[model samples]
Target: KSCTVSEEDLTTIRNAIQKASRASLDDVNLDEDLIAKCPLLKTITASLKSVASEIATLKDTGISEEQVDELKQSYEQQVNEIVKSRDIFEKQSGGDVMKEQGAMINRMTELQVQVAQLQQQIGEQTSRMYDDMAELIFQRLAMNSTDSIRNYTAHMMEQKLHTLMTKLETNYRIFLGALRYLDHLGDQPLIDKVFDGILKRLDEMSLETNKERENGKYVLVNLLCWTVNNRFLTEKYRKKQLELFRIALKFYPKTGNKEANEADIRGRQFCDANFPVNVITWFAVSRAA
Candidate 1:
């Protein structure tokens, strides 16, 4: 729509744009309803649309180059401000916010690409105009922001790991403990400590807590697989570990039904893996010897 912009209106647009641009992300409430309630954004959008349309009209009417340049400069500054805001958000949130607004970010990315072609038809300067706007629009849709994953240290992740381990089944708990212990492979003391603790627990399992010996067997099988995979047991220790695994296997439920034999079935899956295959092969050969 063609609209007339008086000098006063131009000044008001410039001031409002500056004010909006300066507002911090914290100051700018990220309410989804901001599209309806944000008067400042509404004013800036309306003023820019009016000014852009008027500038097109001015090409036919008599207007100074200086006035046109000033308006374009204001438009570019607002775009820069918005882009800057988004950059700040991305840096602070570690791209989590960007992932949440995937669609919006994708649209902005498309628009930025399109802007290059549009600039070919328009002017180089005009194409450069949407650079900041594209970035800002992409970041504006950020639904949630968080610290980057890189910022978190391994020790810092212990609580999350603990919580995850706490929720898993007894079989998986032993599996994860062995896996985590191996992950700290350089620390032999820590590895031995974790191994001893797990072994102690294995020895204490009662028929009451480990019904039909299924749960206990399942934990033993996983631990055995982990030990063989890590080469944690050598010739002398291998016999002891193999004996433990054999005992577990012997006590594993004889039932063929899924509910009754779930642990045995799972343990058998671990035992069938290549590392466990090697362990089983060695056990057979050692017994023959």
Candidate 2:
């Protein structure tokens, strides 16, 4: 049975068939044999280049400040509208509607660029804010607390503690440096020479002279103790800072030089702990403060 078709319906059918046939023939002729057959993609790509060039020229034209401001506001509004509409369209049409919303896509791209510029400005403004605030606070605190409760009550305590520790350590290092210097010299005849030199120097000094014991064994002992406290001993001892005190008892003299038994005492004790080595060590570093 042949049914008569309306003119409008016949025209639409003819257009659809023509579109579909041409589309199929174009795909067969232009598409890569092994790849996705998208012949219209070349047309789309060429159109995109032309559109980008037009946009670039539009941006490069000289414009007034008011014009710039108006364009910025308009672009933002269009971008926002696109975002709201795109979300709805994507949900209803599964993203196929993007090709129909050309203006919205263009506005979205412009908005992304504008947003990047605005973010750069905001970053510059914020980066220095906290630094400035901290600097101002530090200066105010320093000014207001000059010779006040802060310095005298808190800082002074720290200063005193530091000073005491430093002095003690200085003395300890002097002793240890001398002991380690002597420790370097193993048992030898040269030990007697160094020992004799020390005794001779002591004899040269007067009993009432302060310089008499300046470079004597007592000074070396004090230096060693200081080194032990400052360099060797620590709060937690993370490093290998050696405590000379650990070996102090072994090398320490039992009696002073004044005691007759002191020579026997110092000599016997010295040999037992390899004192000759320590003597040579102390000899090399005797001039050090």
Candidate 3:
């Protein structure tokens, strides 16, 4: 439907369009709904003014009613463009705000994941302490075997002796070699410490704690494993645990020489018996001889 522009409406349309055009670059700002309130009336004024200007400039020209209608059509086209530009500007402005909000949301998600990972690490370490205590106790029990017990006592005696005999250099070799092999395999996460006084430390730890301090050692060892791997442990830990029992068995032998049995030797040798790689193998392979 066609609409005519009053003088007042024409003035308002002219001012709004000029301001919006200037705001395209300068400081002038226009709110589309507020400024372009009566688009049809604005079109009528602009069209009439355009025709009057053209006719006045060309006295000899044969401009008719058809020319005026064409001018109105042109004004309609211009009005459509103005409204479309305003819609596009609003959409783009809102999109930018949403994009920033999305970025903040993504960062928050990442932080949450990091926090969860740290909590898991702490839980793993606590669980490992308990395991170490159990292993220490098991070994203590093995050590108390009698002459006719027919247990792992004989083998345990030997390994414990061997454990004591191992020089500091050999200890370092064992510690470092394990790290190197893991490095070669591209295994992630590495050990950062070597217990220079591990034997002394263990002896001290034995005295300080109540609730079977010997058993508490198992918990510590497992906790160490958890620290390095970022999890409790993939391997069953039965073997390393058994090693502790064997070690303690050495301290108090029931019979025979302090020589490790064939089974203990084999137990130490079979690294791949576990489904995943054993932590002992990681250390043992470095100084197998």
Compared with the true structure, what per-residue lDDT tens digits does model 1 show for residues 1-289? 1222333443343344444333221122223343343233443354444445544543432235665566456555644554444432222255565464333333234334432333333343432333322223213322111222234455643333333222222434334433543454355543443344445455554557544355655555565665654565443246466555444434443322334444344545544454443333444335435
Each prediction's RMSD over C-alphas, in Å, is 23.6, 32.9, 32.6
By summed lDDT, the worst window of 10 consecutive residues in model 3 runs over: 189-198
Q: After superposition, how far is residue 107 of candidate 1 from its true place, in Å?
A: 25
- TM-score, candidate 3, is 0.18
TM-score (all chains, Cα) for each model = 0.30, 0.18, 0.18
Which model scores highest in lDDT?
1
lDDT of 3 by residue, 1-289 (tens): 3223344543444455444322121222334453354334333334334433433332222234554354434434443454344222222255566554233223223323433343344334323332333233323434212231234354564444334323211222223233333334332311111121232334333334443343333333423343344332323234245443333333223223223432333333313243112333333332333
What are the lDDT scores of the predictions, listed in order?
Answer: 0.41, 0.32, 0.34
Clashes of each: 0, 19, 13
Question: How many residue-pair clashes does candidate 3 contain?
Answer: 13
Better model by TM-score: candidate 1 vs candidate 2: 1
Residue 231 in model 3: shift from native, Å?
A: 23
Error of 3 at 258 (Å): 30
The parts of candidate 1 lying over 4 Å away from their true place are 1-178, 209-214, 234-239, 242-246, 253-289
Better of 2 and 3 by lDDT: 3
The regions of model 2 sitting more than 4 angstroms off are: 1-102, 143-289
lDDT of 2 by residue, 62-122 (tens): 3345543443454334334433443322222655655543443343343344334433443
